[PDB]
UniProtKB/Swiss-Prot annotation:
Induction context: By infection with necrotrophic pathogens and by paraquat. Not induced by salicylic acid, jasmonate or 1-aminocyclopropane-1-carboxylate (ACC). Induced by flagellin (flg22).
Part of the full-length chain shown: 52 to 360 of 395
Phenotype for residue 206 to R: Impaired flg22-induced ubiquination, internalization of BIK1 and FLS2 from the plasma membrane and reactive oxygen species (ROS) production, as well as enhanced susceptibilitye to the bacterial pathogen Pseudomonas syringae pv
Protein name per Swiss-Prot or TrEMBL: Serine/threonine-protein kinase BIK1
Effect of residue 257 to R: Impaired flg22-induced ubiquination, internalization of BIK1 and FLS2 from the plasma membrane and reactive oxygen species (ROS) production, as well as enhanced susceptibilitye to the bacterial pathogen Pseudomonas syringae pv
Organism of provenance: Arabidopsis thaliana
Entry keyword annotation includes Transcription regulation: no
Amino acid sequence: VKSFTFNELKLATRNFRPCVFKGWLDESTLTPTKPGTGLVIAVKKLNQEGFQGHREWLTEINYLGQLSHPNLVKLIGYCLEDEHRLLVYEFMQKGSLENHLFRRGAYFKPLPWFLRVNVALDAAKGLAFLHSDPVKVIYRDIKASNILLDADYNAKLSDFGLYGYAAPEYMSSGHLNARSDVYSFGVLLLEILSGKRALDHNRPAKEENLVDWARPYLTSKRKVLLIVDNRLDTQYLPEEAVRMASVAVQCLSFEPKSRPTMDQVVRALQQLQDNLGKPS
């Protein structure tokens, strides 16, 4: 993980031009280049939270630098100067998953079925890596806003430190662990399958929550198919949507110990991805 001067990122990002700032670097030297050339970076401004000291922050940055994974946004560098604290990630060209699922359409086209399966699988692989034994990290913020897409539709978990998807044990007792992440992942799966936001106030009462709106439909295959995004018509085999809904429902089990691990959902979604398009 490289260290940058405030001036280096000052040059790279067109004078910190306006959600955080877009920059450019020469890929070999990691030095500022002219805009539109070389590696595109994203620089994030970080305020000091909890009075964290320089040494603690640098240590956290050090551990984050060890968490390289194809489904986590790559940390390129950082900056620590005159109280300045900046982070340098790879720029994700296609933004967050939100912009590719919801969005007042008519002239907008969301992700097709194959890329929805692939994106779900990618997020699952990142989260499973964070839950793995040599990592032991709880993401806490599994949300469609934090699934970023690159220029080839590769999905990665947004940057993370060391509402709408809340697990039951979190609402009740503030609990937060890997199983909580699993429940939130189930909510995300419902979002991907239906194309509807997890929490919508412009929805009838007792249905403003996506899990609650979907609960009576998650009772049979025929009713499961009723919540599939209608913009996905003819693209999927019914058993594929039923499979994704099944994984989501098992992730959404009320008792945390009934929810599968992220490795297991990775296996399931990987089978779904591997057999996509054919009856198999």
